[PDB]
Design a protein around this ligand. Structure first.
Ligand SMILES: NC(=O)c1ccc[n+]([C@@H]2O[C@H](COP(=O)([O-])OP(=O)([O-])OC[C@H]3O[C@@H](n4cnc5c4nc[n+]4cc[nH]c54)[C@H](O)[C@@H]3O)[C@@H](O)[C@H]2O)c1
Ligand SMILES: NC(=O)c1ccc[n+]([C@@H]2O[C@H](COP(=O)([O-])OP(=O)([O-])OC[C@H]3O[C@@H](n4cnc5c4nc[n+]4cc[nH]c54)[C@H](O)[C@@H]3O)[C@@H](O)[C@H]2O)c1
Ligand SMILES: NC(=O)c1ccc[n+]([C@@H]2O[C@H](COP(=O)([O-])OP(=O)([O-])OC[C@H]3O[C@@H](n4cnc5c4nc[n+]4cc[nH]c54)[C@H](O)[C@@H]3O)[C@@H](O)[C@H]2O)c1
Ligand SMILES: O=P1(O)OC[C@H]2O[C@@H](O[C@H]3[C@@H](O)[C@H](n4cnc5c4ncn4ccnc54)O[C@@H]3COP(=O)(O)O1)[C@H](O)[C@@H]2O
Ligand SMILES: O=P1(O)OC[C@H]2O[C@@H](O[C@H]3[C@@H](O)[C@H](n4cnc5c4ncn4ccnc54)O[C@@H]3COP(=O)(O)O1)[C@H](O)[C@@H]2O
Ligand SMILES: O=P1(O)OC[C@H]2O[C@@H](O[C@H]3[C@@H](O)[C@H](n4cnc5c4ncn4ccnc54)O[C@@H]3COP(=O)(O)O1)[C@H](O)[C@@H]2O
Lengths: 473, 473, 473
């Protein structure tokens, strides 16, 4: 768990992303942990040529402009520097991979590198990268996300926004990008990551949006790390910097941009992981097959499964089922009862009955893996089939459990149902920290209660629902 | 083996590439086997909109120009078509991978797709892709090859050369690319693959180079498939098409471009594989360790190894040795005698002595794999070490043989030397077709003679040299 | 040390040359210190024949054109003059030898003499000299550099560009050379040495490149000597000449050519020597053999050597080692740890194990000399072997030190390691000015600290690294 402000932000932004109305605004700071050297370090020889010192300079745009002025406006050196630096092959950080995995269809970047594009490519996602006005007129077919590189691309250094001339002519040359960013800011919920909010173009666009929409501006989010006490600095200077940062945050609020203050930069990764988990765990994989329903009678167990599926649908969960013999019909009935109040939404219930025959069993493993990949939580019930007239614990449920563990999915074996479910519950309780690291007391109590045969249908269903909810929320 | 013309071309172009003075000119036809639909198929709705038929049209540039004329010069539809088609994700063909593996530093492409770029990326090579005049002013650091997309990129459809207006303004807008291609044509040996030589820009550039250099033009190569009898066509029409193609190839030779006529398009892959094999097999991995030199005396075996290494250096082979105990010193002496006639060129002899100690043995496997990867032919001699005062057949030579086989390197175990070399020779002779598929009678005779103890030093060395040469050449 | 502008230029141009993307543009002024009489002195009788005075004339091209006009366009006299003058045998200056020693593959010359060609020949380098349009169509095999004599050769006086007619017909006759120079100016980093930038052809080419590339021109460098007060001139005239030169330099920046102002012409030699030293010292020769590691334990010394080699690789140094007994394995391990993060680049680590036996010891001396020649800095560690069961200071390390001194390589004996290293450190400290003339206080302090046994592994390694870096950088 994190700070209550962080928890509220995680809930709200997960809600925004699940509606596919969220955009990510990534600054250069998101790529500073990857391995690219700092822009000030690159400009250090540039500053030394014109007789300045990059460490004593804070406005690097004016520094680059001064260098260009000292060379009759020529940018060849800076173009070569940025091409040499930001085109290097660097391993992607975890933040880029998580952002690629999230269902985010809009990225706006002020960085010249192609880390977002590579992260989207490695997720088998089609990325429509735009850094030219002409490129706005063409859309890639079946694209997953669109990346607006509003400061240019690394492979086109001459069109990168680096000097004051570029910022001054941006409002004329790149006006369609300004219009697009204004439309996204008024129509989408943005998350600013790695952005210092010192960009003149972004200040201009935000001021225009504020002038247009007054107090009815859309709420956006930013992630900013708190000020850290430098070794040379004194306590008074640190407190002054903290107060300055606080005033900087209220000003951003003037643009209806709420700032989340983070202790360190790894909290960005933690927040992204939490959002990804909240999105992924909303889909539950219901598994099991039952000819004999352990201690419970047939009708009682059927009603239990029906009401469990109805509660899962009611709690805004998407059920994926393999249509196991003896369990599939009743989860289908529960979903139908919950939804027919109507049509079967494709997202709420995904049914994947296994092909029957010799041909089906060849691809059964890939079918099972594809079915499980859609989910983030696996729920196992019973696990008994009939082979030679006798009830024998099933083997498909064990394969499902193995696939779920290999995909880092949460496993919720209900031991009260018995058979392979009870075996899996015993296995999980044998090594609880391996499957649920850092579990709370309530989580342990719910997991232990999952193997209670004295619970009624309602009590067991409520225990399962609460366990799945604390896993997801 | 292929046609004598093809063999002469393979020898000459391998010679050109090994000097790193060869360039590849790839047309759109090189990407027509990957999965991209034909440009005529894309223009079929375009032709139907202006009332024409793309099947009845041969000049598609004029067709696109007519379509643009019917729409007040607007190219949005064609830009969208090319962006949708040529930006799709398609698996690379073998030709692109072989070309990426070859030491070719210059590519000139008339195709908009990024197949060459992806092939170079998958080989861990830095590719400097150029399709804008500005991009010519910046060079990537430590780049392996430069790709000039002279007709534009797929991600920038508006700048693609498709219509007659683009060809008519190319000489003004893209003049630096014309100058660069002229310089490459006069300074590098080109191989035209997938090019139909119907491009007005290439005709203009070739005519300018011819006018500048008269009969002293640099020779270039092209690969063209012979005409095939269409099912509907008659014999007379097929013969007329063959004569027309012959006249086309002879006019092509007016520009000092020799054409290799191929029966089918897989012969392009065969030629590329042959060139890659000729380049790769010129580096021989000399392996072995010997305390007791089988039947031969110590001095006799040392002289044999020395003269074998001297002959390998004399036959233009690059020796890579692991400095095995008892074999390394004498191959070093042979290389020194062959070269000191002088300094040790880094390419001719690469020495990789194994680190000694517990720390070295941890990375010994990766060291061995990296050492073997540099070579294409593995030669094994003896293979006996001393462990507890007795001569025991070594185990490192077996690992080297396994790595060589896993890398598809040719293995030449000399059974006359005995020990692990004799064991490897017996293993190879056990399954000869697995290691040398489609071997000739001379190759089998040489392999059998490799295990003859009655041969002298000169005879055995000549047998080894001839076997390695027929493997390489 | 030189001016900070000169230091920045040296760093940037060393970086450019080490990437093998640097070209040298040599004017006639680079050959005016060799012994050739001035062109005005040669034209003095030519000027007197048409009634003019060469001292009162500044445009010698127009003077030669007037002379040709007075003789019906005949150039026999001027051809004879240039053939007699510039074909004389003159000893090469230091600048030509340094430029030949540098890894520069492209020279462009406006001088008719063959000094660059002779300097490249005396370095055992293959030079491909081009002064005819036809010669551009043929490339020498295994050439080290290509020399474009764009104003003609001395042995072909009739084709030398001397008169206004030659300059006026250059754009038509020598158009391929114009295209080649434009391509080099846009693809390579040029250094202009001895060039006055008053050549109409170079002005035309630079204007065309500027018109083509606007502010995205590649940065180039020029070396220009500052104006000197003539004995007859007054202070006001000298200041006017200084201002005129400043305006001239600022107008070459219009072409993105940065000018380095030098006090005298020997600073060209100093800059070239500094660049050569920076390139040469980046390769360090690691020497030593150790059975007993002085005061330090075996494992401690092994870890020290491993981390020292890892730091050397990390600091962009290329290690050349003779694989000495007890030192070679651990430097190999350090290089492998630094690089496997991967394959062993041939440049980063060159391993030269000595051949073992009577045959190897015959060529051991030449092998050692060839191994050391690749480096510019020699680092000596320990130097103790075992001969008759007792630790005896080695003799190969002494030979290595002697060879390093004979090649003017920097020697860094680490006295803390003891044995021959300590003896060499004592010898160097005995005559410090002989080995390190003009050493700073920091260099002396580091050299003294090199013989401190109280330093830890990290402290000693940092001292060695800092000493080697101040030697190189
Ligand atoms: O141009 P710009 O205005 O887009 O950004 P900037 O001025 O270059 O970079 C300054 C910004 O970079 C942000 N920043 C620094 N380091 C990190 C970071 N954020 C996340 N992570 C993750 C790891 N490391 C970091 C930091 O939040 C700051 O606001
Ligand atoms: O002029 P251009 O650059 O636009 O080329 P084009 O007119 O589009 O394509 C026509 C050219 O495409 C060539 N061609 C057709 N198919 C293949 C091929 N070459 C190799 N392979 C390998 C597999 N398949 C092929 C064929 O050699 C022909 O010359
Ligand atoms: O024809 P061009 O336009 O190619 O050159 P120019 O007009 O003949 O020679 C004039 C040029 O010769 C340059 N210059 C004079 N002397 C030296 C020199 N540079 C180096 N060094 C080294 C020793 N001495 C010198 C000087 O820098 C001047 O720019
Ligand atoms: O019980 P298990 O071991 O694992 C149970 C899991 O598997 C999947 O459902 C089973 C099974 O109910 C279904 N099935 C239905 N009718 C027959 C049948 N299979 C073989 N038959 C032979 C004759 N009639 C049948 O076929 C799936 C594959 O078979 P298994 O994986 O071996 O089944 C669910 O997702 C369930 O979670
Ligand atoms: O003979 P093999 O099985 O394989 C032979 C192949 O290996 C490599 O050279 C060997 C070996 O000559 C060398 N080596 C030298 N001196 C010693 C030593 N190894 C262990 N020692 C213990 C005491 N003294 C030594 O260490 C390499 C690794 O050892 P192995 O691979 O086990 O050696 C070549 O490339 C050779 O082709
Ligand atoms: O130590 P030093 O005087 O100089 C040390 C320098 O020389 C070179 O490495 C030595 C030495 O480690 C190596 N070597 C390994 N094993 C044996 C052997 N030499 C004779 N043997 C007899 C029996 N076993 C050996 O042979 C090189 C030549 O021998 P020397 O130059 O006389 O060796 C490095 O570059 C080192 O810097």
């Amino acid at each position: 768990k994190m700070n209550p402000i962080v928890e509220l932000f995680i809930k709200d932004f997960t809600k925004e992303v699940m509606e596919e109305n969220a955009a990510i605004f990534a600054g250069a700071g998101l790529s500073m942990s990857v391995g690219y050297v700092s822009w000030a370090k690159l400009l250090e020889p540039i500053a030394q040529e014109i007789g300045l010192d990059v460490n004593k300079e804070n406005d690097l745009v004016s520094l680059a402009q001064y260098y260009c002025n000292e060379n009759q406006g020529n940018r060849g050196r800076i173009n070569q520097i940025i091409l040499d630096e930001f085109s290097r092959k660097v391993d992607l950080t975890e933040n880029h991979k998580i952002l690629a995995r999230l269902p985010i269809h809009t990225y706006w970047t002020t960085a010249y590198d192609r880390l977002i594009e590579k992260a989207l490519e490695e997720e088998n996602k089609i990325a429509d990268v735009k850094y030219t006005v002409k490129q706005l007129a063409t859309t890639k077919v079946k694209r997953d996300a669109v990346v607006y590189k509003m400061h240019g691309d690394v492979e086109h250094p001459s069109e990168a926004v680096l000097i004051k001339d570029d910022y001054e002519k941006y409002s004329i040359k790149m006006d369609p990008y300004i219009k697009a960013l204004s439309g996204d800011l008024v129509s989408k919920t943005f998350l600013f990551v790695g952005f210092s909010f010192t960009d003149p173009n972004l200040d201009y666009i935000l001021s225009r949006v504020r002038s247009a929409y007054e107090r009815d501006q859309r709420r956006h989010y930013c992630l900013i790390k708190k000020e850290e006490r430098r070794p040379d600095e004194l306590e008074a200077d640190f407190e002054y910097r903290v107060r300055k940062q606080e005033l900087f945050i209220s000003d951003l609020s003037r643009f209806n941009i709420k700032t989340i203050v983070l202790n360190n930069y790894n909290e960005i990764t933690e927040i992204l992981q939490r959002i990804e988990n909240n999105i992924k765990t909303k889909t539950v994989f219901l598994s099991g097959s039952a000819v004999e329903y352990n201690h419970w009678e047939t009708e009682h167990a059927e009603q239990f499964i029906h009401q469990l599926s109805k509660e899962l649908i009611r709690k805004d969960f998407n059920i994926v089922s393999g249509f196991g013999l003896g369990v599939g019909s009743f989860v289908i009935n529960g979903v139908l009862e919950e939804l027919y109040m109507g049509t079967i939404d494709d997202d709420r219930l995904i049914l994947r009955p296994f092909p029957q025959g010799k041909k089906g069993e060849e691809q059964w493993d890939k079918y099972r893996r594809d079915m499980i990949t859609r989910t983030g939580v696996s729920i196992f019930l019973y696990g008994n089939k009939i082979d030679k007239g006798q009830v024998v614990k099933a083997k498909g449920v064990q394969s499902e459990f193995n696939i779920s563990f290999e995909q880092n999915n949460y496993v919720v074996p209900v031991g009260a149902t018995g058979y392979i479910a009870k075996d899996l519950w015993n296995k999980v309780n044998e090594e609880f920290e391996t499957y649920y690291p850092g579990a709370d007391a309530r989580m342990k109590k719910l997991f232990g209660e999952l193997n209670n045969e004295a619970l009624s249908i309602e009590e067991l269903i409520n225990t399962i629902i609460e366990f799945v909810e604390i896993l997801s929320n």
